From a paper:
In the other lobe, the H/ACA proteins and TCAB1 associate with the H/ACA domain of hTR to form the H/ACA RNP, which plays a crucial role for telomerase biogenesis. The H/ACA domain of hTR exhibits a dual-hairpin structure, characteristic of RNAs within the H/ACA RNP family. Each RNA hairpin associates with four H/ACA proteins including dyskerin, NHP2, NOP10 and GAR1 (30). We refer to the H/ACA proteins as either the 5’ or 3’ heterotetramers, depending on whether they are bound to the 5’ or 3’ hairpin of hTR, respectively. Thus, our work provides a structural evidence for G-quadruplex formation in human telomerase. Our structure confirms that the 5’ G-quadruplex structure can co-exist with the P1a stem. The 5’ G-quadruplex packs against P4 and P4.1 stems of hTR. The G-quadruplex is also stabilized by the 5’ GAR1 within a single protomer, revealing another mode of RNA binding by GAR1. Our observation is supported by a recent study, which demonstrates that GAR1 interacts with G-quadruplex RNAs both in living cells and in vitro.
The enzymatic activity of telomerase relies on a telomerase reverse transcriptase (TERT) and an internal RNA template contained in the telomerase RNA (TER or hTR in humans). The human telomerase holoenzyme contains 11 accessory subunits, including histone H2A-H2B dimer, two sets of the H/ACA heterotetramers (dyskerin, NOP10, NHP2 and GAR1) and telomerase Cajal body localization factor, TCAB1 (8, 9). Recent cryo-electron microscopy (cryo-EM) structures revealed the segregation of human telomerase subunits into two lobes flexibly connected by hTR.
Residue numbers in the entry:
A (entry chain F), B (entry chain J): 1 to 64
C (entry chain I), D (entry chain E): 23 to 152
E (entry chain G): 43 to 395
F (entry chain C): 23 to 186, 192 to 421
G (entry chain H): 65 to 161
H (entry chain D): 66 to 159
I (entry chain K): 146 to 204, 209 to 443, 449 to 489, 510 to 522
Amino acid sequence: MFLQYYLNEQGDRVYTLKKFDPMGQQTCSAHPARFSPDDKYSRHRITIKKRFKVLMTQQPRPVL
Amino acid sequence: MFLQYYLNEQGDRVYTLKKFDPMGQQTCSAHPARFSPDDKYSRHRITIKKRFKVLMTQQPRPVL
Amino acid sequence: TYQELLVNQNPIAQPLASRRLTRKLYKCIKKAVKQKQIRRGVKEVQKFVNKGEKGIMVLAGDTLPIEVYCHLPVMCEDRNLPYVYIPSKTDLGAAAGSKRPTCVIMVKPHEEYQEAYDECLEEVQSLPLP
Amino acid sequence: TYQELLVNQNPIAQPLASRRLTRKLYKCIKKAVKQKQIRRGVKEVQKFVNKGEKGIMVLAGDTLPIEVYCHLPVMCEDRNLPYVYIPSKTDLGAAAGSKRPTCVIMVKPHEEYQEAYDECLEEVQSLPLP
Amino acid sequence: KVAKLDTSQWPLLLKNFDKLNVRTTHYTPLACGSNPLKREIGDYIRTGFINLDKPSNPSSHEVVAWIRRILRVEKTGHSGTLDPKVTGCLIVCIERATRLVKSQQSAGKEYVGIVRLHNAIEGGTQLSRALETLTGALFQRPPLIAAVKRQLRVRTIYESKMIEYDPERRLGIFWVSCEAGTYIRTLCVHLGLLLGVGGQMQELRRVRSGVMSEKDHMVTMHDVLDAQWLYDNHKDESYLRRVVYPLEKLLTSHKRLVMKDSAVNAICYGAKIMLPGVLRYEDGIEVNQEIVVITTKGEAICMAIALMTTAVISTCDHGIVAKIKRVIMERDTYPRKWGLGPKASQKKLMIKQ
Amino acid sequence: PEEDVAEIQHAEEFLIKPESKVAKLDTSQWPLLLKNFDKLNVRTTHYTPLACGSNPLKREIGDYIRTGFINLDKPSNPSSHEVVAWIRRILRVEKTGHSGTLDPKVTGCLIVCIERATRLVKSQQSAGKEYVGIVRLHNAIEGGTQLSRALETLTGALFQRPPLRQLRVRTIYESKMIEYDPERRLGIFWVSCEAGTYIRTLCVHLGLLLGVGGQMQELRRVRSGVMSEKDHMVTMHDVLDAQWLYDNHKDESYLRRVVYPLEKLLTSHKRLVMKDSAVNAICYGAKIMLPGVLRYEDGIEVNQEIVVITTKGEAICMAIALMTTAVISTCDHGIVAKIKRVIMERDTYPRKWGLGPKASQKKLMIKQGLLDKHGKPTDSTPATWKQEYVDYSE
Amino acid sequence: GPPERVVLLGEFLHPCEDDIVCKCTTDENKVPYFNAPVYLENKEQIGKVDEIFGQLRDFYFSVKLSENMKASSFKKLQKFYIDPYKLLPLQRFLPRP
Amino acid sequence: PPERVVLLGEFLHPCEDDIVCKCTTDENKVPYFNAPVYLENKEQIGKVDEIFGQLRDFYFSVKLSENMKASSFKKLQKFYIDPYKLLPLQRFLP
Amino acid sequence: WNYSFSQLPRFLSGSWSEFSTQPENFLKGCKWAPDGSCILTNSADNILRIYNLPPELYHVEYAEMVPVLRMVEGDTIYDYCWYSLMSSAQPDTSYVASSSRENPIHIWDAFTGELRASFRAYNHLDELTAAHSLCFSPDGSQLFCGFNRTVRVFSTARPGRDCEVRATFAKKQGQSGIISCIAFSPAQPLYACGSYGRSLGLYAWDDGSPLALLGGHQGGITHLCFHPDGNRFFSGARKDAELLCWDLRQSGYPLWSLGREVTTNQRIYFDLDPTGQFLVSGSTSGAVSVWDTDGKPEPVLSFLPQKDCTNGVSLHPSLPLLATASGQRVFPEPTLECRLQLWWCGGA
RNA sequence: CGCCUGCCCAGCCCCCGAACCCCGCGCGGGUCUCUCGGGGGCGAGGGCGAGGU
RNA sequence: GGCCUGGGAGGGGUGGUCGCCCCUCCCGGGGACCUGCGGCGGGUCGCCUGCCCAGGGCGAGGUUCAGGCGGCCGCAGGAAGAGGAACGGAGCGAGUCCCCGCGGGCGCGAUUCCCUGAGCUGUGGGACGUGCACCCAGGACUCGCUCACACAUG
């Protein structure tokens, strides 16, 4: 997978083929993680996402 | 009993087993004083709590 | 060492005894315990102040919460009994030959330490009152 | 370079290995690569930890998205395995003897290099919680 | 000086009233009510509650008995039992505030307790993991009572935290946030089984009862006795007015609906809350939602169930905004002012004519 | 001073004073189809609300999921049909659909509609879509200006053919070059296009037009109609975890960040607020007649697709406007719109047609034998009724 | 007496004060009766279900052992079996619709 | 062999084993898939495999017959088709 | 070899260094295993320690003794004991019972030092109560243990909460207080319970029915010993000068009184010979006193192990070895190390 | 091929080399889809003249 | 699937204003309310009907799952003009359920009533006298009494 990105000042994705930003830091991979329906690590993912305050519920609420 | 506490810098109780807090002061017991309904020392408690400016009526009034 | 205990004092712990007066009071308690002439608990001290038994009532100035013993100062002022605070409850218990602390002790007078008792009594009554 | 790699870091990448502990871990991995004791990638490490193996699980702190390997920390805590985050993904793969980056590897013990393994293990066991 | 105060510093249910949606600004004020904080001491106590710090010897029903001797009132309730040796936050509702006990008893509690383990564990992290395991919806057997075997039931533990661990005495402080009716003694037994060493709850203290906590407004039993004494002997209310708080403080989380003075007495007699009497209404009123209906002086009239949403109120011109759940205010606090309105007058006129 | 504020709170009297100024609402922050509810033109305020439905955001969790969708970030192994089948299995739900088939190795925006939101899938499938792909050229090029010129050339209404059928027309609205790498002969392009545009085919045509030849290396969908990759986008892990958290901790919080009500897809459309009595009639397939219109938005035009909503902000149906805004404001009677697609279930709101004045009049005349059994005129009908009553069947 | 058949109740985890803690692994996540006899696959009674605890879909149970049994006897991941009439469905404990 | 032939398009730069051609058919008429492409003398060059570009101005690639080579054709060299394998824009446009 | 206190006991190695880890540590008795293989010691650090019989005895200077096991409790250890029918030839018999504050009665394996079993005593509220005393029956089938106003009887075969409860105080009548010690008659089918409430009680083994209730002592009773005759037995108390001699015949009143200095709230142990002729006891002063039981017991010897309280004394069942445990609670003032010791008491 | 063991084909994951591409003056240096070769892990989709009850 | 059908005008052939066939030009028609669900849009050996020689085979048709990606057919619900400015409430009391770990809690007296126990414990533990106050309040259902039957006065 070649497609990478870095976030703009506006907040949107700037797509790129390079593995570093103009400002030095690493570009994230554009594609989401692989998923399989047999996954039984929901407890595990939630447990540590709570610890570091990165669970989706704990973020600022969206504008509707 | 076993539960003690000391106050942090924003006035929250910080519970602990240890008799001294991290700054070397003694920790208070978490539990209130034992009460008797036949207590006849109401005059006496008001008398010296007024004297040392620690009666509840002399404190800053709560914001509601 | 004394100045470190001064951090732990109550809102109501006055008049606090001087560093040397604290030492005199402990030595008087040791002699009174040997003679079987003290009362230790609030439970006890309160009972015999009600009966009207005289003595110097020594209080621990780091007692919390204050509701446990803060009635006793006024009970003494009703009957003109001399009372005084001291830095710590652990040392007050230690003075009576005990590992556990206590928040109040009342020392009764007796012949064997009458001069030491009167020396303590004299300085207690001389203290400035808040 | 170590201090520069903190800019690239991941929200969940703690406890992070120190500059010196990172150096010790790479050399323990390289020794384990020669003896073929390591297990590389999520699929293998997840399989072997579930199967019943024990050792030290070295995670990469540059990994994104976190969903690829954020289940592994708790898989260790269920079986009391030690784990630690090192700064880079590319360095982990180079130390593991691969020409691609890698997000996680598990180092197993061996009689050949127990001195270096013990220095890492005890230091990693000692790491404070965030 | 009230003119200088921002609306965010107005007391209790009048706080941030300008951010409620305004239906109409016109009504005829009546000299009937007071602000809940300025109620005459008798009425103030009869509509009030105490955020008590329960002592460690008596049962919670003994404590509320003692409070109703002291204050000289006929009714009290108590926001969930604490066991005889347990201390902490016990909301004691007095008289007309006892209408609110179900809302207080059903609220989420928080506890700080000590578990004693019967053998050594590896360390504090192992206890911390067993607490994470017993987060979420748990099975707990309710204890036997009068030889009546209650069935296994489910209770949620929202959060858990391992505060301290002492390997010498094998003692561990824990903090638990949980649903009402959770057995913390049972939690410590399970926490011991999960570790494999065994365990018992050494000690317990409730640090929160829904809206009230030990952080603010909490008083001991001595304050309650002492405040009453000062009122009895010196005719000073000051101490009582810091021990007892008006029941409006328990309702500050609820969505509000402000009513005209004309409507107040009608609602107290059992009339449904109609839309022509609504002055202001909060954002986020939903259908079948429990709301608080208040006067323009901030007094709670009733707990009501909303039959219109916020948006529906904005569009309509008449009709049932809410039905009553429980009337708080007494009848004839305000005068009868119903039947005087334009449509209601027209109805009675056209029946007569 | 904090203490000075506390002292004023207990000393001085507080009162919501009477005023003569006009009561002005602010509905700019209200959720979804209730946003700027104040700005809609008001026909009438006089009706009886029913208290049956809910605000879309605050439906009970079962009803919330059944009337909702997921802006999914599709993972790179499975097919789009397999992905929605997983979501159907996870949420323990009967039916699921999606906003456009992404190929197995393609990622990005896939609006997965759940149960009763699956009535919108045709509208979502026809919506305009944006892609970010990588074209891999078989031979070298002079520079990235040439590949940009090829994308400039293929901006417009194009001929296209499916991958391995008939020739088809597909418009590409806008195209752009993000960057090009001469070493590995890969070029990132972004394209906005209509639904059903084949991007594999576009990459081949870029290759032929340049002369070097080429194919699609990889693809990602960044937009699917109204939803984008920076708008509430969620992964398959989130969907699984949010359901698990609801199952094991009884916590709906995570589900309500994952799933959104179908009304969020319809926020672009012009609104027509119906009276609560008219709602279930329209769900049964009635005409949207003028007596039931409470409010109507500015700038409705003839043959425009409008969303018809309740007073609580629920979507009843998508509909085609027969009257303009100006006509609705001035006319006495008529058909305001006709149904395109009924979203809301039957008997969500109760069955309250035939109770009105003019409807009850017609029922009475049929009972009296003044009209026929099928509501049609006779010779005996009064000239007042016969002239006034404009029967819409005609 | 011995039941006609027995269904998988759970697997052995660590012992705890002379009774055995077991992870529950029932089909359809069914919950055992209190004091329900626990059998090994040979249909020999080892004990009775004492405690039931943990999350709804990942719960444990302790087993008060029989007169002749010892907690040291059991090995890790050893399976235990229950009379299927002495289970209840999970739906019972889940909230009313 | 065709009865008669009509212009198909002119030669554009070659591709890998194909020749790309810009269409210049009368009234923009679109050629059929797999239709034989001819020279001015009715000698078949190849067969039309792919058709692409905008509806008004579009291109077509020709899969060459085995004898021909892509490099041999001159710049703007014209190519032909039988008129029965052409289609109007009005089929595709609406 | 046979016991003889015609001469002062000769010193044999003891342990002092490990007890000095904690400040103000002190021993809380010592007990030989009933086969005579090793000695068990309690201490104020809440650590039971087992020391093997010295190899240098059978093999002169002896090195400082080192314990083969340390088995840690998390709270004050109220009582501890060897299994009644222990033999070092059988791993199934070699184990140590131990009770502790707010904890179950733990059973420790005497070879490996692992927690082997747990007996648990709950009150009517289902809260765990700790046993203040422990005693195995002379068959080794049952584990008797004392609480406030009640003895419980756990079956040794079935470890757990299951127990036969025996109330000693019913409707303000019977033996009151915490039952601080149990002991069984070698010959008769009975057991004797001492309490911190002054009284002694005798009870039938099979039923738990009271046979007698005896006064005598002026403080809380701390220890009991039956003579190998079966008729005669002895008792001692805290803050009480007399060690009272009793007899099952001519009951109701103690036959003799033996003086010893006890000025603390301590369990100052005493022990008989295996033959039953001598009786040894410790003291708060330090002086270990010896009496010949064979009339009133005649004073034979008094010697001083150390300049400190001798809380524990234990006599070896086969060999002439006296063990002595030392130390006591130090009381503070506003602003010698304790030790186990062995002693040869054989004849010349 | 009822069952079990073993072998072959297909599929999935990891490492190395060659060709191709890029840069410099037959040579040197640096990357990556597809294709070809080698090594490691894994049979129940298909086949088997072998072994066991 | 090189769509289907009717009328008028002109030219050619054949037979007894008339019938039939072919070509060219012009014009009309292919209808049947609204909504929801399902099926068709080659290849599923899983079921049924039919055909042939508790079994086997088949170029046809159909139902329920699985797979692939507007038009027609079938079934079901409606045949809808959109009502109602007191509807049908409250507060108490009782019976029955839910809730529901509650002999323990409090005080005083005398031998300082005993006790710094290694036993919790003097900010409290116990013994004996003695007295005292606790064991509800809520919610739901059901059958009474009281107060109203209220659209909220520009």
